[PDB]
Design a protein around this motif. Structure first.
Motif, PDB file in Angstrom:
ATOM      1  N   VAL A  51      -1.492  -6.396   7.716  1.00 30.93           N
ATOM      2  CA  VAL A  51      -2.588  -7.033   6.488  1.00 30.93           C
ATOM      3  C   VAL A  51      -2.721  -7.854   6.074  1.00 30.93           C
ATOM      4  O   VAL A  51      -3.426  -8.886   5.615  1.00 30.93           O
ATOM      5  CB  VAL A  51      -3.442  -5.747   6.991  1.00 30.93           C
ATOM      6  N   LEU A  52      -1.236  -7.770   4.975  1.00 32.31           N
ATOM      7  CA  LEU A  52      -0.751  -8.347   3.694  1.00 32.31           C
ATOM      8  C   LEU A  52      -0.514  -9.145   4.322  1.00 32.31           C
ATOM      9  O   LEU A  52      -1.467 -10.838   3.856  1.00 32.31           O
ATOM     10  CB  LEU A  52       0.221  -7.203   3.321  1.00 32.31           C
ATOM     11  N   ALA A  53       0.132  -9.770   5.257  1.00 31.58           N
ATOM     12  CA  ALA A  53       0.535 -10.960   5.637  1.00 31.58           C
ATOM     13  C   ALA A  53      -0.501 -12.257   6.442  1.00 31.58           C
ATOM     14  O   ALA A  53      -0.845 -13.493   6.222  1.00 31.58           O
ATOM     15  CB  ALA A  53       1.437 -11.317   6.883  1.00 31.58           C
ATOM     16  N   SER A  54      -1.502 -11.445   6.534  1.00 30.68           N
ATOM     17  CA  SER A  54      -2.857 -12.117   7.279  1.00 30.68           C
ATOM     18  C   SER A  54      -3.394 -12.550   6.018  1.00 30.68           C
ATOM     19  O   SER A  54      -4.472 -13.821   6.096  1.00 30.68           O
ATOM     20  CB  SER A  54      -3.606 -11.286   7.866  1.00 30.68           C
ATOM     21  N   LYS A  55      -3.015 -12.216   4.831  1.00 28.19           N
ATOM     22  CA  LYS A  55      -3.645 -12.909   3.681  1.00 28.19           C
ATOM     23  C   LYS A  55      -2.912 -14.074   2.410  1.00 28.19           C
ATOM     24  O   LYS A  55      -2.978 -13.449   2.252  1.00 28.19           O
ATOM     25  CB  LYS A  55      -4.928 -11.851   3.003  1.00 28.19           C
ATOM     26  N   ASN A  56      -1.767 -13.784   3.580  1.00 27.55           N
ATOM     27  CA  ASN A  56      -0.104 -14.262   3.019  1.00 27.55           C
ATOM     28  C   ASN A  56       0.385 -13.352   1.732  1.00 27.55           C
ATOM     29  O   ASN A  56       0.584 -14.898   0.789  1.00 27.55           O
ATOM     30  CB  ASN A  56      -1.229 -15.679   2.755  1.00 27.55           C
ATOM     31  N   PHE A  57       0.028 -12.535   1.760  1.00 24.89           N
ATOM     32  CA  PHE A  57       0.697 -11.540   0.868  1.00 24.89           C
ATOM     33  C   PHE A  57       2.102 -11.222   1.513  1.00 24.89           C
ATOM     34  O   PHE A  57       2.131 -10.610   2.490  1.00 24.89           O
ATOM     35  CB  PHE A  57       0.528 -10.189   0.373  1.00 24.89           C
ATOM     36  N   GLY A  58       3.315 -11.791   0.581  1.00 26.54           N
ATOM     37  CA  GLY A  58       4.182 -11.783   1.268  1.00 26.54           C
ATOM     38  C   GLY A  58       5.257 -10.235   0.969  1.00 26.54           C
ATOM     39  O   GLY A  58       4.649  -9.560   0.930  1.00 26.54           O
ATOM     40  N   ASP A  59       7.030 -10.849   1.743  1.00 23.71           N
ATOM     41  CA  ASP A  59       7.283  -8.773   1.527  1.00 23.71           C
ATOM     42  C   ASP A  59       7.416  -8.693  -0.069  1.00 23.71           C
ATOM     43  O   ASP A  59       7.395  -7.167  -0.299  1.00 23.71           O
ATOM     44  CB  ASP A  59       9.446  -9.509   2.159  1.00 23.71           C
ATOM     45  N   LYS A  60       7.341  -9.055  -1.027  1.00 24.11           N
ATOM     46  CA  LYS A  60       7.549  -9.184  -2.295  1.00 24.11           C
ATOM     47  C   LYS A  60       6.371  -7.773  -2.295  1.00 24.11           C
ATOM     48  O   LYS A  60       6.395  -6.536  -3.164  1.00 24.11           O
ATOM     49  CB  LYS A  60       7.278  -9.920  -3.470  1.00 24.11           C
ATOM     50  N   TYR A  61       5.172  -7.731  -1.774  1.00 20.38           N
ATOM     51  CA  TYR A  61       3.761  -7.136  -1.141  1.00 20.38           C
ATOM     52  C   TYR A  61       3.798  -5.876  -0.297  1.00 20.38           C
ATOM     53  O   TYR A  61       2.949  -4.358  -0.656  1.00 20.38           O
ATOM     54  CB  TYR A  61       2.131  -8.124  -1.495  1.00 20.38           C
ATOM     55  N   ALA A  62       4.290  -6.188   0.608  1.00 21.92           N
ATOM     56  CA  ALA A  62       4.673  -5.472   1.234  1.00 21.92           C
ATOM     57  C   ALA A  62       5.769  -4.200   0.716  1.00 21.92           C
ATOM     58  O   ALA A  62       5.242  -2.732   1.240  1.00 21.92           O
ATOM     59  CB  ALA A  62       5.564  -5.701   2.746  1.00 21.92           C
ATOM     60  N   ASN A  63       6.163  -4.048  -0.127  1.00 24.85           N
ATOM     61  CA  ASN A  63       7.588  -3.616  -0.766  1.00 24.85           C
ATOM     62  C   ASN A  63       6.723  -2.449  -1.691  1.00 24.85           C
ATOM     63  O   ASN A  63       6.964  -1.541  -2.016  1.00 24.85           O
ATOM     64  CB  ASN A  63       8.916  -4.438  -1.074  1.00 24.85           C
ATOM     65  N   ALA A  64       6.177  -3.220  -1.955  1.00 21.88           N
ATOM     66  CA  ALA A  64       5.347  -2.683  -3.586  1.00 21.88           C
ATOM     67  C   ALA A  64       4.622  -1.236  -2.884  1.00 21.88           C
ATOM     68  O   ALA A  64       4.273  -0.465  -3.287  1.00 21.88           O
ATOM     69  CB  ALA A  64       4.263  -3.294  -4.211  1.00 21.88           C
ATOM     70  N   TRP A  65       3.496  -1.924  -1.401  1.00 24.80           N
ATOM     71  CA  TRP A  65       2.630  -0.968  -1.291  1.00 24.80           C
ATOM     72  C   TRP A  65       3.978   0.378  -0.633  1.00 24.80           C
ATOM     73  O   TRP A  65       2.921   1.265   0.587  1.00 24.80           O
ATOM     74  CB  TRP A  65       1.735  -1.782   0.100  1.00 24.80           C
ATOM     75  N   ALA A  66       4.653   0.023   0.055  1.00 25.56           N
ATOM     76  CA  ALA A  66       5.514   0.471   0.539  1.00 25.56           C
ATOM     77  C   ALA A  66       5.938   1.856  -0.473  1.00 25.56           C
ATOM     78  O   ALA A  66       6.297   2.725  -0.127  1.00 25.56           O
ATOM     79  CB  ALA A  66       6.736   0.617   1.088  1.00 25.56           C
ATOM     80  N   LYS A  67       5.902   1.544  -2.116  1.00 24.63           N
ATOM     81  CA  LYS A  67       6.496   2.191  -3.435  1.00 24.63           C
ATOM     82  C   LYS A  67       5.583   3.596  -2.879  1.00 24.63           C
ATOM     83  O   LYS A  67       5.191   4.515  -3.519  1.00 24.63           O
ATOM     84  CB  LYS A  67       7.103   1.827  -4.585  1.00 24.63           C
ATOM     85  N   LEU A  68       4.345   2.598  -2.529  1.00 22.87           N
ATOM     86  CA  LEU A  68       2.748   3.599  -3.226  1.00 22.87           C
ATOM     87  C   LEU A  68       2.967   4.969  -2.053  1.00 22.87           C
ATOM     88  O   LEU A  68       1.974   5.893  -2.145  1.00 22.87           O
ATOM     89  CB  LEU A  68       1.305   2.939  -3.441  1.00 22.87           C
ATOM     90  N   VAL A  69       2.810   3.826  -0.298  1.00 24.34           N
ATOM     91  CA  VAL A  69       3.291   5.687  -0.017  1.00 24.34           C
ATOM     92  C   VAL A  69       3.630   6.353   0.391  1.00 24.34           C
ATOM     93  O   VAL A  69       4.219   7.983   1.270  1.00 24.34           O
ATOM     94  CB  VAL A  69       3.412   4.352   1.235  1.00 24.34           C
ATOM     95  N   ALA A  70       4.952   6.062  -0.417  1.00 19.71           N
ATOM     96  CA  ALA A  70       6.343   7.128  -0.874  1.00 19.71           C
ATOM     97  C   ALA A  70       5.529   8.016  -1.538  1.00 19.71           C
ATOM     98  O   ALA A  70       6.651   8.954  -1.782  1.00 19.71           O
ATOM     99  CB  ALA A  70       7.876   6.253  -0.923  1.00 19.71           C
ATOM    100  N   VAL A  71       4.640   7.596  -2.592  1.00 22.67           N
ATOM    101  CA  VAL A  71       4.122   8.923  -3.279  1.00 22.67           C
ATOM    102  C   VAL A  71       3.722   9.840  -2.583  1.00 22.67           C
ATOM    103  O   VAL A  71       3.968  11.182  -2.794  1.00 22.67           O
ATOM    104  CB  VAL A  71       2.976   8.162  -4.554  1.00 22.67           C
ATOM    105  N   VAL A  72       2.648   9.631  -1.369  1.00 23.50           N
ATOM    106  CA  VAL A  72       2.256  10.628  -0.936  1.00 23.50           C
ATOM    107  C   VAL A  72       3.315  10.853   0.091  1.00 23.50           C
ATOM    108  O   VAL A  72       3.174  12.000   0.111  1.00 23.50           O
ATOM    109  CB  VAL A  72       1.436   9.764   0.589  1.00 23.50           C
ATOM    110  N   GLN A  73       4.433  10.311   0.796  1.00 20.32           N
ATOM    111  CA  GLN A  73       5.248  11.092   1.420  1.00 20.32           C
ATOM    112  C   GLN A  73       5.898  11.882   0.739  1.00 20.32           C
ATOM    113  O   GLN A  73       6.541  13.163   1.401  1.00 20.32           O
ATOM    114  CB  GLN A  73       6.227  10.061   1.726  1.00 20.32           C
ATOM    115  N   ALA A  74       6.207  12.236  -0.636  1.00 21.43           N
ATOM    116  CA  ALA A  74       6.898  12.997  -1.367  1.00 21.43           C
ATOM    117  C   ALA A  74       6.080  14.121  -1.554  1.00 21.43           C
ATOM    118  O   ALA A  74       6.599  15.051  -2.284  1.00 21.43           O
ATOM    119  CB  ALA A  74       6.837  12.171  -2.770  1.00 21.43           C
ATOM    120  N   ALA A  75       4.218  14.125  -0.721  1.00 25.65           N
ATOM    121  CA  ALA A  75       3.750  15.415  -1.054  1.00 25.65           C
ATOM    122  C   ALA A  75       3.854  16.031   0.349  1.00 25.65           C
ATOM    123  O   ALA A  75       3.338  16.958  -0.001  1.00 25.65           O
ATOM    124  CB  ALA A  75       2.558  15.118  -1.850  1.00 25.65           C
ATOM    125  N   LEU A  76       4.471  15.308   1.080  1.00 20.09           N
ATOM    126  CA  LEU A  76       4.618  15.581   2.827  1.00 20.09           C
ATOM    127  C   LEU A  76       6.272  16.176   3.265  1.00 20.09           C
ATOM    128  O   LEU A  76       7.392  16.357   2.429  1.00 20.09           O
ATOM    129  CB  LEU A  76       4.072  14.441   3.601  1.00 20.09           C
TER     130      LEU A  76
END
Ligand code: HEM
Ligand code: HEM
Lengths: 145, 145
Positions: free
Chosen positions: A120-145
């Motif tokens: 979805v990020l790529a469909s708006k031209n947001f590259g890997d740097k942004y996908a990695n940033a989001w992976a970090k936010l998702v990881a916060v949730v994973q820390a709770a699961l």
């Protein structure tokens, strides 16, 4: 701990999250449904979890799927608005974690959302740097699961 | 009928919801907790439904309560943002309705939120006019319970 995961989010990561959310978060209905359908398309094994939504192949036309897809985008809106106060980010992340824990969703399974987010990020031209940033936010949730 | 209820949201009602929301929606943590605590205070008989949150008398100091309170404000944010499209508003309202239907919350008991909202609005100098506008948006959710 979740707090540790949250507390790590640096100023640069927060910057990329907010810059990319300004765009993908501007069309919650559109990008929200795109997120969910992509998840079903690339991870057909998760479809069974969403039986309450009926036939998810209906896409936008499925009112239950549309209501759910819009609501998840507000869950992310919530996260984005709490970035500068780890204490508030943790209490909201744990609230949503319970929603998935009750549905038997593991940290590994929850991380399956990274693929769709990347597209979805790529469909708006947001590259890997942004996908990695989001992976970090998702990881916060994973820390709770 | 949730659809007839949604039709009750006229131009004037929608303006009043937007104008007042710009103020109370600016401090979701503060007003969110104010709402929930006022509900418990004025309607003690509803506390039992929130067993998961623990000791709700702790207010802001209760992380679970604070996480829940912030989150409901995003639900209201959702409704406001869907006011332009009644079809989208209905699908998100039905989504949240299910969340309360599984908790055994009737339309009558869901209505007990009107008191708290009137008070929270009054504390920000918004009178009956606005309290009534919000009572109509709440009625839509009630029509789905
Ligand atoms: C960006 C990540 C995600 C966010 C922000 C998110 C958000 C949400 C929200 C707000 C709900 C509604 C909670 C409720 O009302 O009970 C929900 C429900 C659900 N989520 Fe997630 N979710 C995400 C990823 C996932 C993933 C990857 C899975 C599974 C592989 C998953 C499985 C579920 C299931 C099974 C439900 C129940 C749907 C229903 O029956 O209504 N979620 N999610
Ligand atoms: C302005 C009206 C209200 C809004 C927008 C609202 C919104 C929400 C939201 C977003 C949730 C979380 C859904 C989930 O994760 O399962 C929730 C949960 C809940 N709500 Fe409401 N609610 C409102 C009024 C009420 C009222 C008046 C009652 C009770 C008389 C009530 C009872 C519940 C209960 C029991 C839960 C479960 C809490 C938990 O165990 O985590 N709600 N509400």
């Amino acid at each position: 701990s979740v707090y540790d995961a949250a507390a790590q989010l640096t100023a640069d990561v927060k910057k990329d999250l907010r810059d990319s959310w300004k765009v993908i978060g501007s069309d919650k209905k559109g990008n929200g449904v795109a997120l969910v359908t992509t998840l079903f398309a690339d991870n057909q094994e998760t479809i069974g979890y969403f039986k309450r939504l009926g036939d998810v192949s209906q896409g936008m036309a499925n009112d239950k799927l549309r209501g759910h897809s819009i609501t998840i985008m507000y869950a992310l809106q919530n996260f984005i608005d709490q970035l500068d106060n780890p204490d508030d980010l943790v209490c909201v992340v744990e609230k949503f974690a319970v929603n998935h824990i009750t549905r038997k969703i593991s940290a590994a399974e929850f991380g399956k959302i990274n693929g769709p987010i990347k597209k979805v990020l790529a469909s708006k031209n947001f590259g890997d740097k942004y996908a990695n940033a989001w992976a970090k936010l998702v990881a916060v949730v994973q820390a709770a699961l």
